[PDB]
Amino acid sequence: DPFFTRGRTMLVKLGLEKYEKNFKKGLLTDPTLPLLTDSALKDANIPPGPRLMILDHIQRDPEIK
């Protein structure tokens, strides 16, 4: 939970809260957020639209280290 708090915040902001399970399953912990790639999110079973929204968020939000 505490290792996933910032990721949960991003998903809530994107309207993608359903994929928090996918982040946990993939061990997409908060240190991974600045490093996410399309390949990693696809391996976590996130569909194309949500991947685009997540990747754009991490490239734009200065909240993501």
Residue numbers in the entry: 193 to 257
Article excerpt on this structure:
Named Tric1 and Tric2 (tRNA import component 1 and tRNA import component 2), these almost identical proteins belong to the preprotein and amino acid transporters (PRAT) family of proteins but are distinct from other PRATs in that they also contain a C-terminal SAM (sterile-alpha-motif) domain. The mitochondrial outer membrane proteins, Tric1 and Tric2, contain a C-terminal SAM domain that is required for the efficient uptake of tRNA into plant mitochondria. In Arabidopsis Tric1 and Tric2 SAM domains have been shown to bind tRNAala via key lysine residues at positions 205 and 210 and are required for tRNA import into the mitochondria in vivo. The protein adopts a characteristic fold consisting of a 5-alpha-helical bundle.
The wildtype (WT) SAM domain structure was determined by MAD phasing from a selenomethionine mutant; the protein chain has three methionine residues including the first methionine in the N terminal Histidine tag however only the methionine residues from the SAM domain (Met202 and Met 245) were used for phasing. The final structural model was refined to 1.48 Å resolution. The asymmetric unit of the crystal for the WT structure contains three monomers with identical contacts between the three protein chains. Specifically, the side chain of Asp235 of one subunit makes hydrogen bond contacts to the side chains of Lys234 and Arg243 of the adjacent subunit. Additionally, the main chain carbonyl atom of Gly218 of one subunit makes a hydrogen bond contact with the main chain nitrogen atom of Gly241 of the adjacent subunit. Further analysis of the crystal lattice revealed a helical superstructure, similar to other SAM domains. This superhelix consists of six monomers per turn with a pitch of 28 Å. Besides the lateral interactions, intermolecular hydrogen bond interactions between the side chain nitrogen atom of Lys217 of one monomer and the main chain oxygen atoms of Ile250, Asp253 and Ile256 at the C-terminus of the domain on a neighboring symmetry related monomer parallel to the helical axis further strengthen the superstructure formed in the crystal lattice. Pure SAM domain eluted from the column as two main species, an oligomer at a retention volume of ∼58 ml, and a further peak at a retention volume of ∼90 ml, representing the monomeric SAM domain. Interestingly, both the heated and unheated oligomeric samples appeared on the blot at approximately 50 kDa, a higher molecular weight than would be expected for the monomer (∼11 kDa). This suggests that WT SAM domain forms a highly thermally stable oligomeric form in solution.
